Write a protein that holds these residues in place. Structure first.
Motif, PDB file in Angstrom:
ATOM      1  N   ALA A 121     -47.569 -31.785-137.291  1.00 21.66           N
ATOM      2  CA  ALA A 121     -47.742 -31.576-138.736  1.00 21.66           C
ATOM      3  C   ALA A 121     -48.493 -30.265-138.953  1.00 21.66           C
ATOM      4  O   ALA A 121     -49.654 -30.151-138.479  1.00 21.66           O
ATOM      5  CB  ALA A 121     -48.470 -32.776-139.335  1.00 21.66           C
ATOM      6  N   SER A 156     -41.283 -33.793-143.639  1.00 25.71           N
ATOM      7  CA  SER A 156     -41.539 -32.448-144.212  1.00 25.71           C
ATOM      8  C   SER A 156     -42.651 -31.773-143.405  1.00 25.71           C
ATOM      9  O   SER A 156     -43.635 -32.460-143.070  1.00 25.71           O
ATOM     10  CB  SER A 156     -41.877 -32.532-145.678  1.00 25.71           C
ATOM     11  OG  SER A 156     -43.240 -32.877-145.876  1.00 25.71           O
ATOM     12  N   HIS A 157     -42.478 -30.484-143.095  1.00 27.99           N
ATOM     13  CA  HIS A 157     -43.466 -29.629-142.388  1.00 27.99           C
ATOM     14  C   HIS A 157     -43.690 -30.156-140.962  1.00 27.99           C
ATOM     15  O   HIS A 157     -44.851 -30.177-140.518  1.00 27.99           O
ATOM     16  CB  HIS A 157     -44.776 -29.559-143.188  1.00 27.99           C
ATOM     17  CG  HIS A 157     -44.626 -29.100-144.601  1.00 27.99           C
ATOM     18  ND1 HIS A 157     -45.470 -28.162-145.157  1.00 27.99           N
ATOM     19  CD2 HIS A 157     -43.769 -29.465-145.580  1.00 27.99           C
ATOM     20  CE1 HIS A 157     -45.128 -27.956-146.416  1.00 27.99           C
ATOM     21  NE2 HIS A 157     -44.082 -28.740-146.697  1.00 27.99           N
ATOM     22  N   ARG A 176     -45.762 -35.522-145.320  1.00 25.16           N
ATOM     23  CA  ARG A 176     -46.347 -34.683-144.230  1.00 25.16           C
ATOM     24  C   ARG A 176     -47.038 -35.521-143.129  1.00 25.16           C
ATOM     25  O   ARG A 176     -47.337 -34.912-142.040  1.00 25.16           O
ATOM     26  CB  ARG A 176     -47.305 -33.673-144.846  1.00 25.16           C
ATOM     27  CG  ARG A 176     -46.610 -32.767-145.854  1.00 25.16           C
ATOM     28  CD  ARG A 176     -47.486 -31.646-146.338  1.00 25.16           C
ATOM     29  NE  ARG A 176     -47.883 -30.706-145.293  1.00 25.16           N
ATOM     30  CZ  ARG A 176     -48.445 -29.515-145.526  1.00 25.16           C
ATOM     31  NH1 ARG A 176     -48.648 -29.079-146.759  1.00 25.16           N
ATOM     32  NH2 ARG A 176     -48.759 -28.726-144.520  1.00 25.16           N
TER      33      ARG A 176
END
Ligand SMILES: Cc1ccc(OCC(=O)N2CCOCC2)c(C)c1
Ligand SMILES: [Zn+2]
Length: 140
Positions: A129, A90-91, A32
């Motif tokens: 993020a 991710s994210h 992240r």
């Protein structure tokens, strides 16, 4: 640079975390680019819980807040640099907006509060993020 100060917590890009952040670590995720650490004084920001795709982000490398549309948190990636050179993500929420590597930490905010911080971007894209799934930030 930049942080979310939410209660006694400090949310920062993992790649900009200080020795003090690591020495007062609450939680971290390389996938992240997020790291959370402890504070002694309480902080003045609040966290959005929502599925907003419109908001405004701070771009230090224009001293400007820009209104943007941005994607929902997903799995994305990049192309060579020097600290993390390319990487996935991710994210990562993406928007059309001017972002250079040092734009990381700028807040993205919607009507529900803080959404996220600048994490990646390139070729007139800025990536944020998400911190909206992180419900535990509000309590304890
Ligand atoms: C917010 C933000 C974060 C990273 C980023 O690019 C710097 C970097 O990671 N590189 C990978 C891709 O190739 C260029 C160098 C940009 C443009 C903006
Ligand atoms: Zn919202």
């Amino acid at each position: 640079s930049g942080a979310i100060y939410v209660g006694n917590y400090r949310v920062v890009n993992r790649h900009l975390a200080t020795h003090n952040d690591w020495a007062n670590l609450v939680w971290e995720d390389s996938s992240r680019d997020l790291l959370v650490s402890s504070t002694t004084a309480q902080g003045c920001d609040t966290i959005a819980r929502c599925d907003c795709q419109t908001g405004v982000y701070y771009c230090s490398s224009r001293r400007k807040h820009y209104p943007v549309s941005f994607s929902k948190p997903s799995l994305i990636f990049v192309e060579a640099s020097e600290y993390y050179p390319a990487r996935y993500q991710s994210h990562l929420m993406l928007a059309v907006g001017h972002s250079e590597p040092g734009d990381c930490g700028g807040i993205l905010r919607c009507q529900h509060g803080v959404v996220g911080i600048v994490s990646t971007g390139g070729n007139g894209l800025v990536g944020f993020a998400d911190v909206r799934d992180l419900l535990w930030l509000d309590e304890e």
